[PDB]
Amino acid sequence: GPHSLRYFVTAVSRPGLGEPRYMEVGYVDDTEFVRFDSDAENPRYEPRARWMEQEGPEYWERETQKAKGNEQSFRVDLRTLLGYYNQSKGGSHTIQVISGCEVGSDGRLLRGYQQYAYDGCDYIALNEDLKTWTAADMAALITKHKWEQAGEAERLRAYLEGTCVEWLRRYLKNGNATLLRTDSPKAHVTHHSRPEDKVTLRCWALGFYPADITLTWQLNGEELIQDMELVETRPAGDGTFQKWASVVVPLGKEQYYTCHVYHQGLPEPLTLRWEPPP
């Protein structure tokens, strides 16, 4: 399948509390493999996956010094946007960046990303053609003209097509088999009281990786989308994930409902029913 290398960047000013916090977090196929935090006692790039430790001391020193120069660039950027938006030097503000590439099975670039955000709202983004910019407001228009004059879109097309893909394949050689690891969900149904003649049937999916999963409740063969309750997928804390879905059913009609678990680790979708003890 396709692969991706993406970097999530955060720069937060905190006037009166110290220097801005800067973070660089890298993901291979949505999996964190490197992270830089300026608030550490020693600010250095650190591997977040054991398979990144084969990379030599020159790689870590090159990335660390690059992050530190990026941090200075963001410190300047936070001051610039105070002028763009006519904001005071006393407030805290956030700059966020998503940067990276999506690569297909043939090794060719599928999608390139360079997206910015200021205080949680879109600021500017590189368009899918990798030649034009989409600016979200008047302040972003200043950045757009500045970047158009300097050919910045030109500079990222070269990085996204060349540098990003080459690093992604280099990282993939060390961690390709690790990223494909899956853990299938273990599932069961629980039974809970409801007022009067109703009961709740809760279908659990536990200990699965990756996080993508689908849980459905069926009366006969009809999916009960409008009537069920479900929680957002959540981490167990040990690397796996959890999710549940529940429906309120009439008392005595529990055996009329079926739960279905769809996960990429399963040979075929799981089918479950409420099962009372002997």
């Binding site: 890298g26 090159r62 992050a67 990026n70 660039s73 910045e152």
Partner: peptide, 8 residues
């Protein structure tokens, strides 16, 4: 390897 960012 993350890109070197350009000023806004």
């Amino acid at each position: 390897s993350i890109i070197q960012f350009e000023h806004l």
